[PDB]
Design a protein around this ligand. Structure first.
Ligand code: CLA
Ligand code: CLA
Ligand code: CLA
Ligand code: CLA
Ligand code: CLA
Ligand code: CLA
Ligand code: CLA
Ligand SMILES: CCCCCCCCCCCCCCCCCC(=O)OC[C@H](CO[C@@H]1O[C@H](CO)[C@H](O)[C@H](O)[C@H]1O)OC(=O)CCCCCCCCCCCCCCCCC
Ligand SMILES: CCCCCCCCCCCCCCCC(=O)OC[C@H](COP(=O)(O)OC[C@@H](O)CO)OC(=O)CCCCCCCCCCCCCCC
Ligand SMILES: CC1=C(/C=C/C(C)=C/C=C/C(C)=C/C=C/C=C(C)/C=C/C=C(C)/C=C/C2=C(C)CCCC2(C)C)C(C)(C)CCC1
Ligand SMILES: CC1=C(C/C=C(\C)CCC[C@H](C)CCC[C@H](C)CCCC(C)C)C(=O)c2ccccc2C1=O
Ligand code: SF4
Lengths: 150, 733, 165, 80, 64, 144, 40
């Protein structure tokens, strides 16, 4: 819900408020395309996400190149979280059994018995990574965009 | 109790909606039906296969009918280079006038869809030239569909049901399928190429009305019966031949030119004729190997019993395996899916690089769709191959009858197998991801010369052995003094070497550091997917966390929160997790194939060579750059012919995201929510007059995993299909 | 040269790449003063850029049509043409350190298994013992091999727990 | 109805009976253990499959096992 | 007079046990002819947190 | 000990009511009644939500499923140290008594009970699934 | 002081010091030998 709130704010301000004042009038950053385009899901995909992400994906080689790296890294953490959300510890405890066997074979097995995370910790680890990746993705996209044009 | 399902009394007695869902989902698991016997199991499967065959031939008939009725085949054959094929017509009452005009194209009467399946090039190559040719084929296959359907009915009747022993006659079935199903069919297909396809490619019509009075070769069967078989390879089609016409044509019907037809940029028909004649002889011969009622041949049980290494390295060897394979349908199905699944990948690999259909290469959208189509189907079949191998262990594996043989010994060192697959997956993931991230940081900081680019010397060395002289290895076929170069210099090397050293075709594309990284990512996908599937099979019968897992079956929800928690512990769940990695792996393969070809098709291969070494290039120069036309299919100013793919593109994202709901939120939340809905309905006046017959309940634990995986897969497929076609077709088509 | 590559010192694209990076730095330089803090930092960057391109050419690397260094991984091709320092030598450099870390950890884990409460020796590290084992790990390849030949490297199959089969 | 089986490794701790939230299990006299009592499952038609009994069993491997089977109003835990 | 001595170490041979092929300390051996008289204690807990279990005479063997 | 007979006129606790009570199932399939004696008036927690005051002396409650009755039984027994018993009541008027089946709570061993669903073997001694195949229905090796 | 040095021996404290040392060594090496790509 808050992602839509901050997308609504970002597109509305650039389209209708923010801009450069000149002799003829006000020219906005996105040129008042909110009114006609934000009534379809395709409009948000094309005019907001695809068009405004141009700044972040062209940041390499400049002072804003850090936002490009975090934009990719955030995408990674988000997808990494789906591993914990879509699976269950039953698979992972059995996987560790085979891994522990290899360590036992080499007399390098730990004294603290490895255990797959609990059921609840899998859900907590999943949502924390899901939130961090998703929010950091918008964070990089907003700053690299607004700093570049705003 | 309810009638449906008739095959399970447990389901029929269930008062909830689970009865409807589970009845559908257990329909084809014949082994689990009430009163099932082994003999009845085989007869049902035999009947079901007739139904599948009838659907296949009916589906093919529908394609032939619609192209002839609504396509532009007769116009396309005239100028295949500059005409888009038509799949079928559109009658959508929801269309507006701009949509009707947008989809009208190709000189059609009204709106139509453009074909991407390549049936035009295939049918044109095999000798079809007119709409009536397609009409007769459509009626013929509709008739063949009916016959198979009748046979399915016939062999269910009291006097025609085969016995159990009939289905277990291994030696006789292999002899027939190798010699007759494979050998004779390939021999017959050689007849079509010699009698129909090749003459049609030289401007001479041959049909059922005159094929008995037309000589395939000027010397009719005299070379064949006299042993002078070389006469059939004289005067082949010249390099100036214009396909479908008699100018520049030759007379040979069997050749080994080994290259591509210069005009159509596809394999010669005389080579494909000799190919099918060659394997037909091999397959017919190979079908005389096993024992039958005539006192000669091998018995497969004897072969397996013999092959035990004398040192005891493989224990008992292959003793007892004949009954293990001959008595288990899941073992046989696992071998069939594994073999067919690999061959499906081989089809995709060889068809894009050795295009067999005339004018297939220039149709970029068709080539992209065909490769993606079969690689995704191969991926699903491979996951099924391991699933049924896991089902075999639970249901059909008998430890006593496999004592000490190879199969039993696989379970003995399963931890070693899984541990080493785990190491390989970790090693590939760490270093493959690490090198990509390193190259990304270098690009971000503006130092492209500091990145780690490893030359694929081992793969470039293979290309040298095949004759690619770019790398300067001067090895085997790349050296003009090697015996390998000399011996083949009169049969197929002149054509093969000419094609492999042409850099405008997809025959052994040049590779560099960008290809090194992607290939190692593909290896990570194959090994990790195998790890998940192999663990699901070897641990299917039990584990330390659940020693008696076999007593619960292939698919069960869990063993509860005790012992730390056992979510996703069944072998069914290992397959469920492996499907995600299969989609991820095939996605990397199809992204790699598509991007490397788009740059080739535009002539700017340097873009892939430079931008493919870091992951920002993929996101920027492949996904973001090539979406521009797709997402403009409809916009506030209008729409064009791509608006269907633009709509389908978002349609895919929605089904994909809906799948997350079934995978993230689990049953307990929804069952308690439904209980207030049951309360609300009963207390609402004027609505509690109506009532349900099946008590509403939440989906089961296992069901939601399948439902979530189905949405995930469908959204996966539809999103990339729309992007693949739209990006390729709009760019060139 | 190898696989169609050419030495970076002789590569036209490689030379052009250096000019592009220096030109970008110079463009930012002319908006500052001669000896201001930003100007000094930019000049330092340009010196490292020039040094980097000289070092890679001096190292005798191979550049592709992209004009970027490519590495040779085959031991035969590396030793044949003096590219051992790209992958081959660093291969044995990493394994020595990787075995060092792993061998030291295995020695410590065996050492505390004899103690009364091994678990408390893992969360709370025995630093005096760890430092002792850290220094003795320099000879791990010798010690590792001798354990293998004496048969004390691996556990017996009968002393390892396995699931029903 | 689910299937609940008691195996001869039971030590008669009674923890499975206490844990069960539907009074499916009970203790009966026995001579195969020190406690001289064994768990019993006489009312499996009321079992819901929660597996709280398995969580409570000390023996390794479990001495009480629950095999989820055919569903019904009682086993599906419905109040409607 | 039946079973191993108290305090001695034994190796478990029950394939379905968490401690199969592992060594534990004998706590007591019942002499009443029960099915599983031998009681063994282990230093590492199983997945349920338990560290003790009962075994039959033939399911346990002396260390080595 | 003899099987108690339910008294439908037993007074019920002081409870305002809630939306978590009986549904149409009680009128068509079955419902459950729990009764007990209270030493003094006290406040307890309804498994359906809310708080109710138990009258001194007999009390009676009706619940939609068995687990709800046995959830209240655990509360009354463990905290207030009472001894409740509940029945299954069918729409036709029949009443079935249970818990305690024989008058003694199942946790306590009692002579006269007959072992049910007891296997005189370990979990590891079950046969393989192949040996119980084509038995007419999906059967686990534990069943046989 | 014995207990305080025991606290410094806990796993999180040791890892922080160890990686702080390890990271510092790598950072310092790249400060005096910038841009290492080939052993040479
Ligand atoms: C409100 C939206 C909407 C709807 C309702 C339709 C409806 C239709 N479109 Mg249109 N279309 C739309 C929007 C829509 N379109 C948009 C936005 C575009 C983009 C411009 C298009 C572009 C488009 C094209 C390009 C084409 C259509 C076609 C069609 C027709 C398909 C006929 C058919 O095969 O039916 C039967 C439906 C199916 C076979 C598909 C559903 C398959 C089921 C659900 C799978 C599951 C089966 C399972 C066993 C369950 C069985 C249940 C049982 C009760 C039957 C149909 C009239 C096609 C047409 O004209 O065909 C003649 C066609 O070619 N549409
Ligand atoms: C000569 C005798 C003969 C023949 C022709 C067949 C034929 C067939 N039998 Mg067999 N069968 C025989 C004898 C024979 N049988 C005997 C003697 C027995 C008793 C022992 C049996 C017992 C038996 C059983 C029990 C079953 C069959 C089945 C089948 C069918 C398998 C499915 C299929 O169509 O595969 C077709 C396969 C191919 C054409 C080859 C596939 C592999 C190639 C390499 C793929 C690639 C080729 C090429 C490149 C593709 C081009 C594609 C195009 C789009 C360009 C098939 C029709 C099954 C069936 O479906 O029954 C209804 C089945 O259940 N048979
Ligand atoms: C199965 C495929 C097939 C079929 C049905 C035919 C059929 C025909 N061919 Mg063709 N042909 C084929 C494959 C086929 N050909 C192939 C693969 C080649 C390339 C080598 C040729 C090359 C060829 C030439 C060059 C000529 C023909 C000719 C003919 C016609 C006369 C044959 C005749 O009288 O033989 C009489 C022969 C015999 C009495 C003895 C036949 C003995 C052989 C070994 C067959 C044994 C049976 C066989 C294993 C059965 C296979 C399965 C069966 C269902 C077909 C006839 C329409 C001639 C013609 O005039 O066509 C118009 C002609 O000139 N064919
Ligand atoms: C020729 C190959 C083949 C055959 C004969 C079988 C046969 C069987 N399989 Mg196997 N399987 C196969 C291929 C095959 N499989 C493949 C390729 C895979 C990998 C995907 C699997 C994975 C698999 C699993 C994981 C399982 C089986 C099981 C089974 C058994 C029960 C099937 C059932 O009840 O389905 C009932 C069918 C359904 C519930 C619906 C199937 C359709 C799915 C959900 C996708 C629907 C997509 C939809 C049409 C898209 C709409 C799009 C929209 C835009 C309109 C049966 C013996 C099950 C079993 O009991 O094994 C012992 C089992 O657990 N199979
Ligand atoms: C982008 C998403 C993603 C990623 C990165 C992974 C990664 C992994 N999966 Mg997973 N998985 C995913 C999605 C993902 N999965 C999804 C959606 C599912 C469906 C539920 C699964 C289901 C699944 C299964 C069933 C299995 C895996 C396995 C694996 C491993 C494969 C081997 C490998 O690459 O080792 C290399 C490791 C990695 C690439 C992981 C990331 C390493 C990072 C970059 C390290 C960063 C360290 C650095 C110091 C920063 C730390 C900061 C922090 C302290 C704050 C690996 C840990 C297999 C496994 O565990 O094999 C052993 C396995 O069995 N996955
Ligand atoms: C990972 C596998 C692998 C692969 C695919 C290659 C591939 C190659 N190596 Mg390399 N090599 C490898 C691992 C590998 N090597 C390893 C682990 C070592 C030991 C550290 C070497 C040591 C080595 C030497 C010493 C030489 C090569 C050479 C070659 C090339 C030709 C001979 C060859 O090896 O054929 C295919 C590879 C194999 C079948 C695997 C084993 C290869 C052995 C170890 C070396 C064979 C050398 C050969 C006899 C030289 C004859 C003269 C040559 C000019 C024809 C070729 C590019 C030769 C070269 O520089 O050619 C230009 C060469 O002189 N390799
Ligand atoms: C697979 C993983 C991987 C690999 C193989 C490398 C390899 C390398 N990276 Mg890269 N890097 C990676 C991941 C990786 N990176 C990741 C994930 C990131 C993001 C955080 C980066 C970010 C990064 C940067 C920003 C830089 C590098 C650099 C380097 C170089 C460091 C050389 C050095 O420090 O020598 C030091 C010499 C030593 C001997 C170190 C070991 C010391 C011990 C004591 C030796 C003991 C011997 C007995 C080297 C080519 C540097 C470079 O210039 O690359 C060209 C550089 O500036 N990397
Ligand atoms: C500024 C305040 C810094 C921290 C003071 C901690 C005091 C304290 O608790 O001392 C506690 C102990 C010393 O004080 C101990 O107190 C105990 C209380 O029960 C006992 O009386 C011990 O005998 C006594 O030695 O501190 C140390 O041993 C040194 C701590 C580390 C100091 C250097 C790093 C921080 C600067
Ligand atoms: C310097 C000269 C060195 C010559 C070394 C010869 C080793 C022969 C193999 C013994 C290996 C040995 O002890 O075999 C034993 C075992 C075979 O088991 P059996 O029970 O069948 O046989 C036991 C035998 O020892 C006696 O029958 O095979 C293996 O374990 C691996 C087989 C590898 C098979 C490799 C096939 C060929 C691949 C290509 C290799 C290059 C070609 C040349 C080498 C063959
Ligand atoms: C679990 C299980 C299962 C399953 C399995 C699977 C699914 C598998 C797969 C597998 C696979 C999928 C495999 C594959 C393989 C392959 C191979 C092995 C290949 C080979 C090749 C070759 C050898 C080649 C060669 C060559 C070349 C390279 C070139 C030239 C030519 C030649 C030919 C020479 C089953 C059912 C059994 C049952 C039991 C359990
Ligand atoms: C991947 C995964 C695991 C396996 C993940 C585990 C066991 C966590 C791994 C944490 C770290 C990487 C291991 C411990 C590292 C030590 C602290 C030592 C590190 C020493 C230095 C290298 C710092 C689960 O346990 C799980 C449970 C429930 C649902 C989903 C999942 C799930 O998806
Ligand atoms: S089954 Fe387990 S919990 Fe129940 S009495 Fe037996 S040992 Fe105790």
């Amino acid at each position: 819900s808050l992602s839509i709130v901050i997308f609504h704010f970002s597109w509305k301000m650039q389209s209708d408020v923010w801009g450069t004042v000149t002799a003829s009038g006000v020219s906005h950053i996105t040129g008042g395309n909110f009114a006609q385009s934000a009534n379809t899901i395709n409009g948000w995909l094309r005019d907001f996400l695809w068009a405004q992400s141009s700044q972040v994906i062209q940041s390499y080689g400049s002072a804003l190149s850090a936002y490009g790296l975090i934009f990719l890294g955030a995408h990674f953490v988000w997808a990494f979280s789906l591993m914990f959300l879509f699976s269950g510890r039953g698979y992972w405890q059995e996987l560790i059994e085979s891994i522990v066997w290899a360590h036992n074979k080499l007399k390098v097995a730990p004294a603290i018995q490895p255990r797959a995370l609990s059921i609840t910790q899998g859900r907590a680890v999943g949502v924390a990574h899901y939130l961090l990746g998703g929010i950091a993705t918008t964070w990089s996209f907003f700053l690299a965009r607004i700093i570049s044009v705003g | 109790t309810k009638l449906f399902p008739k095959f399970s009394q447990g389901l029929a007695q269930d008062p909830t909606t689970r009865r409807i869902w589970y009845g559908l989902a257990m329909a084809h698991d014949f082994e689990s039906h009430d009163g099932m016997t082994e003999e009845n199991l085989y007869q049902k499967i035999f009947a079901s296969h007739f139904g599948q065959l009838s659907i296949i031939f009916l589906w093919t008939s529908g394609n032939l009918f619609h192209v002839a009725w609504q396509g532009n085949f007769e116009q396309w054959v005239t100028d295949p280079v500059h005409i888009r094929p038509i799949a079928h017509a559109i009658w959508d009452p929801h269309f507006g006038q701009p949509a009707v005009e947008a989809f009208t194209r190709g000189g059609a009467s009204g709106p139509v869809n453009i074909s991407t399946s390549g049936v035009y090039q295939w049918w044109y190559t095999i000798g079809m030239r007119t709409n009536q040719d397609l009409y007769v084929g459509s009626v013929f296959l509709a008739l063949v569909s009916a016959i198979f359907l009748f046979a399915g009915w016939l062999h269910l009747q009291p006097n025609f049901q085969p016995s159990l022993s009939w289905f277990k006659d291994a030696e006789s079935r292999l002899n027939h399928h190798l010699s007759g199903l494979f050998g004779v069919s390939s021999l017959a297909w050689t007849g079509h190429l010699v009698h129909v396809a090749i003459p049609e490619s030289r401007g001479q019509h041959v049909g059922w009305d005159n094929f008995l009075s037309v000589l395939p070769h000027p010397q009719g069967l005299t070379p064949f019966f006299t042993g002078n078989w070389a006469a059939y390879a004289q005067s082949p089609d010249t390099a100036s031949h214009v396909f479908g016409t008699a100018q520049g044509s030759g007379q040979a019907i069997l050749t080994f030119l080994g290259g591509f037809h210069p005009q159509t940029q596809s394999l010669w028909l005389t080579d494909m004729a000799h190919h099918h004649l060659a394997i037909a002889v091999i397959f017919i011969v190979a079908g005389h190997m096993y024992r039958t009622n005539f006192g000669i041949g091998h018995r497969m049980q004897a072969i397996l019993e013999a092959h035990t290494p004398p040192s005891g390295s493989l224990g008992a060897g292959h003793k007892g395996l004949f009954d293990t394979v001959n008595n288990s349908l899941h073992f046989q199905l696992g071998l069939a899916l594994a073999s067919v699944g690999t061959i499906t990948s081989l089809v995709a690999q060889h068809m894009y690089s050795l295009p067999p259909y005339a004018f297939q290469a220039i149709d970029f959208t068709t080539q992209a769709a065909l490769y993606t189509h079969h690689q995704y189907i191969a991926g699903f079949i491979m996951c099924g191959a391991f699933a049924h191998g896991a089902i075999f262990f639970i249901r059909d594996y008998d430890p006593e009858q496999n004592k000490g043989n190879v199969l039993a010994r696989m379970l003995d060192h399963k931890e070693a197998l899984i541990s080493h697959l785990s190491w390989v997956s970790l090693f590939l993931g760490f270093h493959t991801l690490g090198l990509y991230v390193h190259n990304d940081v270098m690009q971000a900081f503006g130092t492209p010369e500091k990145q780690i680019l490893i030359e694929p010397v081992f793969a470039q060395w293979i290309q040298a052995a095949h004759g690619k002289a770019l790398y300067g290895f001067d090895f085997l076929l790349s050296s003009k003094t090697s015996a390998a170069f000399a011996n083949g210099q009169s049969l197929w090397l002149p054509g093969w070497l000419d094609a492999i050293n042409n850099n405008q075709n997809s025959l052994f594309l040049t590779i560099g550091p960008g290809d090194f990284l992607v290939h190692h990512a593909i290896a990570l996908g194959l090994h990790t997917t195998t790890l998940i599937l192999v663990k699901g099979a070897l641990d299917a019968r039990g584990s330390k966390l659940m020693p008696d897992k076999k007593d619960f079956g292939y698919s069960f929800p869990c063993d509860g929160p005790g012992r730390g928690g056992t979510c996703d512990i069944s072998a069914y769940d290992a397959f469920y997790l492996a499907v995600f990695w299969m989609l991820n792996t095939i996605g990397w393969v199809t992204f790699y194939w598509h991007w490397k070809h788009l740059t080739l098709w535009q002539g700017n291969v340097a873009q892939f060579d430079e931008s493919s070494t870091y992951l920002m290039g993929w996101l920027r120069d492949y996904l973001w750059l090539n979406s521009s036309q797709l997402i403009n299919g409809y916009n506030p100013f209008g729409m064009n012919s791509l608006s269907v793919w633009a709509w389908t593109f978002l349609f895919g994202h929605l089904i994909y995201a809906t799948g997350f709901m079934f995978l993230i939120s689990w049953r307990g939340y929804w069952q308690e929510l439904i209980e207030t809905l049951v309360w609300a309905h009963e207390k609402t006046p004027l609505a509690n007059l109506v009532y349900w017959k099946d008590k509403p309940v939440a989906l089961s634990i296992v069901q939601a995993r399948l439902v979530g995986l189905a949405h995930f897969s469908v959204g996966y497929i539809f999103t990339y299909a729309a992007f693949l076609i739209a990006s390729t077709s709009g760019r060139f088509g | 040269d190898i696989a169609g590559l050419t030495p970076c010192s002789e590569s036209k694209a490689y030379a052009k790449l250096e000019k592009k990076e220096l030109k970008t730095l110079e463009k930012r330089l002319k908006q500052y003063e001669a000896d201001s803090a930003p100007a000094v930092a930019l000049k330092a960057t340009m010196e490292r850029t020039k040094a980097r391109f000289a070092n890679y050419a001096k190292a005798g690397l191979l550049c592709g049509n992209d004009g970027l260094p490519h590495l040779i991984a085959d031991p035969g091709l590396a030793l044949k043409y003096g590219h051992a320092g790209e992958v081959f030598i660093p291969t044995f450099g990493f394994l020595y350190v990787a075995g060092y870390i792993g061998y030291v950890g295995r020695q410590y884990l065996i050492a505390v298994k004899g103690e009364a409460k091994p678990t408390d020796k893992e969360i709370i590290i025995d630093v005096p013992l760890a430092t002792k084992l850290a220094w003795q790990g320099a000879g791990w390849p010798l010690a590792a091999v001798q354990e293998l030949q004496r048969g004390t490297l691996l556990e017996k199959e009968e002393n390892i727990t396995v699931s029903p089969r | 109805a689910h299937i609940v089986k008691i195996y001869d490794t039971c030590i008669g701790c009674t923890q499975c009976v206490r844990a069960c939230p539907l009074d499916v299990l009970e203790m009966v006299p026995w001579d195969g253990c020190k406690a001289s009592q064994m768990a019993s499952a006489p009312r499996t038609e009321d079992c819901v499959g929660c597996k709280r009994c398995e969580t409570a069993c000390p023996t390794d491997f479990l001495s009480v096992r629950v095999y989820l089977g055919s569903e019904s109003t009682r086993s599906m835990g419905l109040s409607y | 007079e039946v079973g191993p001595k108290r305090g001695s170490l034994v190796k478990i041979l029950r394939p379905e046990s968490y401690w199969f092929n592992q060594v534990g300390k004998v706590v007591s051996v019942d002499q009443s002819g029960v099915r599983y008289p031998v009681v063994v204690r282990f230093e590492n807990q199983n997945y349920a947190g338990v560290t003790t279990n009962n075994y039959a005479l033939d399911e346990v063997v002396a260390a080595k | 000990w003899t099987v108690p007979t339910l008294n439908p006129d037993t007074p019920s606790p002081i409870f305002g009511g809630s939306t978590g009570g009986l549904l149409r199932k009680a009128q068509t399939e079955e419902f459950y009644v729990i009764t007990w004696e209270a030493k003094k008036e006290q406040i307890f927690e309804m498994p359906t939500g809310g708080a109710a005051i138990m009258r001194q002396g007999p009390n009676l409650l009706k619940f939609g499923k068995k687990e709800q009755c046995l959830a209240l039984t655990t509360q009354l027994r463990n905290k207030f140290k009472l001894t409740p018993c509940f029945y299954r009541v069918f729409p036709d008027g029949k009443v079935q008594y249970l818990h305690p089946a024989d008058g003694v709570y199942p946790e306590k061993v009692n002579a006269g009970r007959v072992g049910a669903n007891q296997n005189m073997r370990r979990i590891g001694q079950n046969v393989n699934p192949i040996k119980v195949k084509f038995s007419g229905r999906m059967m686990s090796p534990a069943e046989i | 002081m014995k207990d305080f040095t025991t606290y410094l021996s806990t796993a999180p404290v040791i890892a922080t010091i160890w990686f702080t040392f390890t990271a510092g060594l790598l950072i310092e090496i790249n400060r005096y030998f910038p841009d290492p790509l080939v052993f040479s």
